[PDB]
Amino acid sequence: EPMELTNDAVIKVIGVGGGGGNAVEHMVRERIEGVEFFAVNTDAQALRKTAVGQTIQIGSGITKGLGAGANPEVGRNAADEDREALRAALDGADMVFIAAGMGGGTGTGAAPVVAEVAKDLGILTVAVVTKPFNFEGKKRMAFAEQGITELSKHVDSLITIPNDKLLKVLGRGISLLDAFGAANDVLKGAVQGIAELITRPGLMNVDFADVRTVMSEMGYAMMGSGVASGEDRAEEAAEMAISSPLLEDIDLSGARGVLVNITAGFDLRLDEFETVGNTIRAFASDNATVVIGTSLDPDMNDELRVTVVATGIG
Amino acid sequence: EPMELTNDAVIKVIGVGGGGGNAVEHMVRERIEGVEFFAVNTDAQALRKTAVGQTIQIGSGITKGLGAGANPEVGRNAADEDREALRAALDGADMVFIAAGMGGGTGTGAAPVVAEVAKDLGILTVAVVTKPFNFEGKKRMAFAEQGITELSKHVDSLITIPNDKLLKVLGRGISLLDAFGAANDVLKGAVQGIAELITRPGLMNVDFADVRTVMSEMGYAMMGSGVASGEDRAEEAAEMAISSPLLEDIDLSGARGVLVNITAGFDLRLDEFETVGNTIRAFASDNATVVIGTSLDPDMNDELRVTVVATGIG
Amino acid sequence: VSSVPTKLEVVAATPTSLLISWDAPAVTVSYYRITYGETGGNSPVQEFTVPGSKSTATISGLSPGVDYTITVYARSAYHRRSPISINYRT
Amino acid sequence: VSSVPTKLEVVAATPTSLLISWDAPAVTVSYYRITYGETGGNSPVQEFTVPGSKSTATISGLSPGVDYTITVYARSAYHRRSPISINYRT
Amino acid sequence: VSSVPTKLEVVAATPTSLLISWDAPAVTVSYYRITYGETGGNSPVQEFTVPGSKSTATISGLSPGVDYTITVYARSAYHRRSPISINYRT
Amino acid sequence: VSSVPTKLEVVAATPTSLLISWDAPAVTVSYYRITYGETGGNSPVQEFTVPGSKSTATISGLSPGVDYTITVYARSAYHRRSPISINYRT
Amino acid sequence: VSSVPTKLEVVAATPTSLLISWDAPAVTVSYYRITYGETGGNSPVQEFTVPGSKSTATISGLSPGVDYTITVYARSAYHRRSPISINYRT
Ligand SMILES: Nc1nc2c(ncn2[C@@H]2O[C@H](COP(=O)(O)OP(=O)(O)O)[C@@H](O)[C@H]2O)c(=O)[nH]1
Ligand SMILES: Nc1nc2c(ncn2[C@@H]2O[C@H](COP(=O)(O)OP(=O)(O)O)[C@@H](O)[C@H]2O)c(=O)[nH]1
């Protein structure tokens, strides 16, 4: 107990379902720093193939290790019967990221249960879930909507990333493997943009309390990002982040809290910090809680990345 | 018992009779993945020649190892007296494929008994049986019809593949060895099309529960497949699968469940998945349970295979 | 012998099965109770019954290279004689 | 056995979890109380309850290479039978 | 043979082309997939399909004195048989 | 490959220049960051950016007979994938 | 235990400090009296009080490699229970 007050922030990322497990395996391969990774799945074979290091097989007495199918209720019952393993894995963390692909059985039904356990443990719970493409039918979309509505009741923030928004930036005649790799990259980008403010901060930094200020009991959230280089990198990156397709569904002036991550190298300037902050606060609302910090990437030169998370959209 | 919940799906294929044993030996040679193969025959010499790895000699006290002849009753009595060996071989499986050639003595009479044992063990039982050619006489056809009627009472799904439908695609002046090799290939194709959704799934996958949803307590089933390449591969393959000669005996709009397997390489696209699903759901009925998954063949490039199983025809 | 059946023969029908044969009884037997399992093994034996008109029984699912013990009980309404047991090493 | 449940099986579902299985009871059990912890360890054991209709329980957060002791209590309104305990070395 | 097609013949129609011939199939083939490239070469192979009613295929743009490997796939709705491969040195 | 871009080609357009080519990306790239310099040289590398709609880049002022290392970064708002590096000896 | 507090934990927050933790009391405590000093040392111990709503206390100015003894008194208007003492070697 005394050591829990004198340690670094513990951040856990749990992927629920096949899509969530694939996304978390991608995050493991791409080496997010200062984060522990878990995969939770009903299908034992898929779990045995996932290279995430620590795996939990839920619903072993309901699905026999053969998957929950396309039924969210079976996934919910599978997660309901193994709340002890979920509690044991989640315990000891300050922030938890729940990555899942809404629409299936395991992820859609089991993400709310993991979220409920994490919140009842007093953990800052951020759900980073996607919606299926329109190419996947209407049943998957209805399941995803129901699962998102259920999940919003047990999370602090819920970042929704519609896959249909990714179609605008995907190459023509692209295989679904590459499209879902892009979706994995977007989920990893959201997790990294929120977590690297804590794990690898810059000189102008924010602490876990600042993050919890805008990520706690907020509800629905959206995420957008932008990059730029040259002399006008700050303004271009900020405007590109505000005008992200993953943010166009909402109005930034209605959000109850904005979290901004500026990733750069050793050449960020004070006026660039000021202009990014001014752009965000100009396109936000007057009474919104705005938290702006910087992260450090040693391999960025003359370039600047800006990530914006808008919370409390409702 | 605890390990039975944390293991891969166990799929067993049992060939009953001489034709079934030949088909299962063909499947062994062609290397279906993640499947265990058995041959059950009254003739001990034929069993000694079958290279399937695990063999069971039924009726050793009624036929003395000399075969049951062309009498289905003798085959039924031969299988009835060795229900313990059948139970011991079948036990421990999630799905069982019973491959046989209807018309003879051993297969026609013994496939229903193996099916009854498998169902009483609580196993998903799929019977993939053929009917004899019209070149084989009327007695074989009557025996086959009686055996199929008897077998339909103890199976979850019964896929009937009439050999007369194969005559439309067989070369002119073809020896019966090549015709029955084609029949073996068709039986292996049915087994592989149902089992590779589980054994080697794609990125858009279905689990054993999804398969059991459309393959359980359904009754009669039919199977059709198609291939295509180029830009229009998905629509062409789907339309060719719907218009298969092995499916023309029924109407796809009367089936109570449709199982679709899309086999492709690493270049399947989302719109292709959507258009195959849309074609199948357009030519099916509104309230039919449609399950669509993908399988992976690394050696397929720019080409696409679609397998359709229609269940609950009645 | 004092045990019914008096004779017991086991033959490997297939590399993973066994054929079991016993002599005909002098008194009608209603059914035969066969209990097979690994010799000196902690796992419970497997049991099944064949009708008394039969004289052979086939057991499957046998792991090669493992000793097996087979016992046959002859259950009749007219006696309570002892069973006969045999050992077979696959 | 005199203890309910009479049989207890443990299987490592994942390299950091355990699956626990017990036999069905002859008398209805309202819930099962499972207490797991390091064998001969000073730290207090972890405890949780599953409903009595269940037959399996999964425990997570287990350090590999460390011995564990698992005890299952069958709590019914119709008996007060002893628990059953097992030792598993991860 | 176990591979469809079973026979494969290659003839140099012109000093910079090859004519490829295979036997007729016992079962209807929808199309043939031919993949040709330098034998043991890092460059990706070239691929094209001919309809299944055909029995010959001509490939052009071949550098003389360079080994080539040709593989033919017979794609039918009724089997998934292996392809057949041949080596030709121009 | 895990690095965007996945393919990188370099051609000497003139005896004192190099043409650099990479494959099209699956996800929109805003700009490409190219860093070229002498391989294993103490001098700082030269850097420039081309827009993401481009697929080629020309670098000049290259001394013949000197090794060069070229690295391309694909900067997109939707990923942070690794760069790809190539070595060319003029 | 008979002493309030019943549990006492010490952790080295920094190489020259210690973090002290005790369990919550069953009865309201007005303040805690902590007395720390070198174990078996002639020098007088250092003393300070924290309010009873707290559960942790940090002590600084600690020489590494020197044993320390820490005693916590729970002063309440409703009991006069004994203190608890711990030994920590820096
Ligand atoms: N990011 C990502 N999303 C996926 C992947 N596979 C599937 N999805 C999405 O996740 C949703 C749920 O599918 P899936 O997770 O496989 O089903 P489940 O395992 O039963 O929960 C689908 O609608 C897909 O849109 C993947 O590999 N990566
Ligand atoms: N697929 C396939 N079917 C066969 C083969 N041989 C026979 N059949 C068919 O199976 C039916 C039953 O014959 P068979 O299995 O040999 O008789 P049984 O062994 O006494 O059951 C016949 O009507 C044939 O049409 C074979 O090698 N392969």
Author numbering:
A (entry chain A), B (entry chain A): 3 to 316
C (entry chain B), D (entry chain B), E (entry chain B), F (entry chain B), G (entry chain B): 1 to 90
Paper excerpt:
Surprisingly, the addition of the Mb stabilized the thick helical tube of KpFtsZ and enabled the structure determination by cryoEM at 2.67 Å resolution. After refining the helical parameters of the KpFtsZ–Mb tube, the reconstituted 3D map revealed a strand of parallel double-helical protofilaments forming the tube with a diameter of 250 Å, with a helical rise of 7.70 Å and a helical twist of –23.40°. C2 symmetry along the tube axis was imposed to improve the resolution and quality of the 3D map as the two parallel KpFtsZ protofilaments formed the double helix. The Mb molecules were located between the two protofilaments and somewhat inside the tube. Residues 4–8 formed a short 310 helix stabilized by the N-terminal cap of Pro4, which was located in a hydrophobic pocket formed by Glu9, Val11, Leu19, and Ser21 of the Mb of the adjacent protofilament. We found GDP in the binding pocket instead of GMPPNP, indicating that added GMPPNP did not replace GDP that was kept bound in KpFtsZ during the purification from E. coli cells.
FtsZ is a tubulin homolog GTPase protein that is widely conserved in bacteria and plays a key role in a complex called divisome, which carries out cell division. FtsZ polymerizes into protofilaments to form the Z-ring that acts as a scaffold for accessory proteins during cell division. FtsZ treadmilling, a motion in which the protofilament polymerizes in one end (plus-end) and depolymerizes in the other end (minus-end), drives cell wall synthesis that constricts the Z-ring to form a septum of the cell. In order to aid high-resolution structure determination of the FtsZ protofilament, we developed a monobody (Mb) that binds to both KpFtsZ and EcFtsZ with high affinity.
